[PDB]
Amino acid sequence: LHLIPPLNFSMVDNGIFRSGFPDSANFSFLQTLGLRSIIYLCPEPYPESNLQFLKSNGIRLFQFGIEGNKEPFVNIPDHKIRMALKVLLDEKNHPVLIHSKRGKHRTGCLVGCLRKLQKWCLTSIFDEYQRFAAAKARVSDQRFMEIFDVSSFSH
Ligand SMILES: O=[P-]([O-])[O-]
Hints:
Layout: E1 10-13, E2 16-19, H1 27-31, E3 37-40, H2 48-57, E4 60-63, H3 78-88, E5 96-99, H4 106-117, H5 122-133, H6 139-147
Parallel strand pairs: 2-5, 3-4, 3-5
Antiparallel strand pairs: 1-2
Helix pairs in contact: 3-4, 4-5, 4-6
The protein binds phosphite ion (PO3).
Family: Belongs to the protein-tyrosine phosphatase family. Atypical dual-specificity phosphatase Siw14-like subfamily.
Enzyme class: hydrolase
Subunit structure: Homodimer and homohexamer; behaves as a monomer in solution.
């Protein structure tokens, strides 16, 4: 028993995964997914370890750096989530891993906005968000999803 999925790893949909920050102990597991892309939601530069992994596996890195904030001073930037959604919705980029640091807040908001585009009721989106965020669930993340306007992605 030798494969180690990254922190808070899950399959979201066909070709879409979510996690926290992968380390070298997770690389043999991530190889089994045949990733084409990573959507990385933190502003910090990617470590050399991770860069060598992407190069060796032909994985494209999309970075939309969202600053970590604490409640009640959270300000999730709409523009970054929408740039990440544009990448996520293009099947040419699949399989894709979405990750942040913990895979709960930034990752949770992006997945919740995908669920809204997939026409899930808000209570079902919030339930999935809360399952990953657990004791760190933020009302501000769920409020962001509540008011997210799908109009410009509806097509
Ligand atoms: O690192 P994250 O849970 O936004």
